[PDB]
Amino acid sequence: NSKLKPEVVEELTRKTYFTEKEVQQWYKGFIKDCPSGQLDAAGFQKIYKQFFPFGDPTKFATFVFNVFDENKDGRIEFSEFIQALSVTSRGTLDEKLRWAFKLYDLDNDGYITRNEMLDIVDAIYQMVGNTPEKRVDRIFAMMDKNADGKLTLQEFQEGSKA
Amino acid sequence: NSKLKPEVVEELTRKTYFTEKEVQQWYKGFIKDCPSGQLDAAGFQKIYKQFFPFGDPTKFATFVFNVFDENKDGRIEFSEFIQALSVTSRGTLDEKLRWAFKLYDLDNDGYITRNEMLDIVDAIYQMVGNTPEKRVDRIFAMMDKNADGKLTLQEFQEGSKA
Ligand SMILES: N#Cc1ccc2[nH]cc(CCCCN3CCN(c4ccc5oc(C(N)=O)cc5c4)CC3)c2c1
Ligand SMILES: N#Cc1ccc2[nH]cc(CCCCN3CCN(c4ccc5oc(C(N)=O)cc5c4)CC3)c2c1
Ligand SMILES: [Ca+2]
Ligand SMILES: [Ca+2]
Ligand SMILES: [Ca+2]
Ligand SMILES: [Ca+2]
Ligand SMILES: [Ca+2]
Ligand SMILES: [Ca+2]
Ligand code: NA
Ligand code: NA
Ligand code: NA
Ligand code: NA
């Protein structure tokens, strides 16, 4: 697919923070980087592995892939790609924190657990190539205001602002 | 330039850790991402700005650009691009630390100063989007074994191994 139909471009423009022109430019890049119009987890993994040669980005890349892959069907289509870039780059602080929460909520149950947060920190450290546990412990002491071992989105947002 | 001449591919293959086939594959990607065959600082900046929407990667991207741009002429040619990826991805630990030293040595005088290191840490924090100063202070206490306020490559390597 070389170019998007104007009905699709319009739809994506109303649904994102991008202009009609930016949507078509983003699509040109997407297809050049993904000739099939869809990126599977292997290809997302390859991308990250090439950008971070000093470490092992496999774990963090998987976490990011799962946020891009909204419908969880194992592939990132252009609609999912451009929506993620729209929110992460031009969304409200509320929308951006909501996106980060999704990244951190690894099993998608609406709660971030201590284990989930430690997996994020561990993954970032591996990708790079005070420790993880003490980090998580402090974060949860400062955000888990009901001390139930889980962070809701409000807890994550309230603390992240603080 | 669609494809490289076999004399050039051979040269790059002997000069890098890549195979003849990998050199040509890397060139296909480079040209698709850089149609003119050369990336200036503006374009490198754009790339990083698109990958890190939550922060400001301008400062760190500049530091990385200067390492890629070995001859310091303001553009990254394919030969410089593939050499950087060769060292960062397949070099000895010694070669990889030497590359990191170049990144950190912002003015290229063969020494990393406290200010240079704080600029690196500050840039990484901005890109992301214990503090920087305390970090630098500890690193220099553990690596500046002659306490002259500068890190030579041997100091950086010895400590980085430690
Ligand atoms: N050892 C060590 C050591 C020690 C202390 C340290 N501090 C910091 C570091 C790491 C700093 C980052 C290095 N990055 C910069 C980006 N980069 C790169 C740019 C463009 C690219 O483009 C593609 C593509 N696929 O097109 C792939 C690709 C990759 C090269 C590797 C470090 C390392
Ligand atoms: N607020 C907040 C907040 C709070 C707490 C947090 N912890 C961690 C975060 C940030 C985590 C990373 C987010 N990245 C992932 C990569 N990514 C992306 C992937 C493919 C891409 O491809 C292109 C292209 N140009 O093709 C561009 C492009 C960009 C989207 C943004 C965070 C944020
Ligand atoms: Ca999907
Ligand atoms: Ca969860
Ligand atoms: Ca809670
Ligand atoms: Ca150059
Ligand atoms: Ca210097
Ligand atoms: Ca010294
Ligand atoms: Na729009
Ligand atoms: Na999630
Ligand atoms: Na080789
Ligand atoms: Na340098």
From Swiss-Prot, chains A, B:
Pfam families, A to Z: EF-hand_1, EF-hand_7
Topology in membrane: Peripheral membrane protein; Lipid-anchor
Predominant cellular place of this UniProt entry's protein: Golgi
Binding residues annotated for Ca(2+) 2, in chain numbering: 105, 107, 109, 111, 116
GO cellular component, one term: axon
A single MF term (Gene Ontology): calcium sensitive guanylate cyclase activator activity
Entry keyword set: Calcium, Cell membrane, Cytoplasm, Golgi apparatus, Lipoprotein, Membrane, Metal-binding, Myristate, Pharmaceutical, Repeat, Synapse
Top-level taxonomic group: Eukaryota
Ranges of residues in domain EF-hand: 20-55, 56-91, 92-127, 131-162
InterPro entries linked to this entry: EF-hand-dom_pair (IPR011992), EF_Hand_1_Ca_BS (IPR018247), EF_hand_dom (IPR002048), Recoverin (IPR028846)
Outcome reported for the amino acid change (mutating residue 77 to T): Reduces calcium binding. Abolishes calcium binding
Cell membrane listed as a keyword: yes
Keyword Transit peptide: no
Binding positions (Ca(2+) 1): 69, 71, 73, 75, 77, 80
Location of the protein in the cell: Golgi apparatus; Postsynaptic density; Cytoplasm, Perinuclear region; Cytoplasm
Record-listed Ca(2+) 3 binding positions: 144, 146, 148, 150, 155
GO annotation, biological process: regulation of neuron projection development; regulation of signal transduction
Function in brief: Neuronal calcium sensor, regulator of G protein-coupled receptor phosphorylation in a calcium dependent manner. Directly regulates GRK1 (RHOK), but not GRK2 to GRK5. Can substitute for calmodulin. Stimulates PI4KB kinase activity. Involved in long-term synaptic plasticity through its interaction with PICK1. May also play a role in neuron differentiation through inhibition of the activity of N-type voltage-gated calcium channel.
Further facts: Binds 3 calcium ions via the second, third and fourth EF-hand.
Subunit and partners: Monomer. Interacts with KCND2. Interacts in a calcium-independent manner with PI4KB. This binding competes with CALN2/CABP7 binding to PI4KB. Interacts in a calcium-dependent manner with PICK1 (via AH domain). Interacts with ARF1, ARF3, ARF5 and ARF6. Interacts with IL1RAPL1. Interacts with RIC8A; interaction is favored in the absence of Ca(2+) and myristoylation of NCS1 is not required.
Family, per entry: Belongs to the recoverin family.
Name this polypeptide is given: Neuronal calcium sensor 1
Naturally occurring in which organism (per UniProt): Homo sapiens (Human)
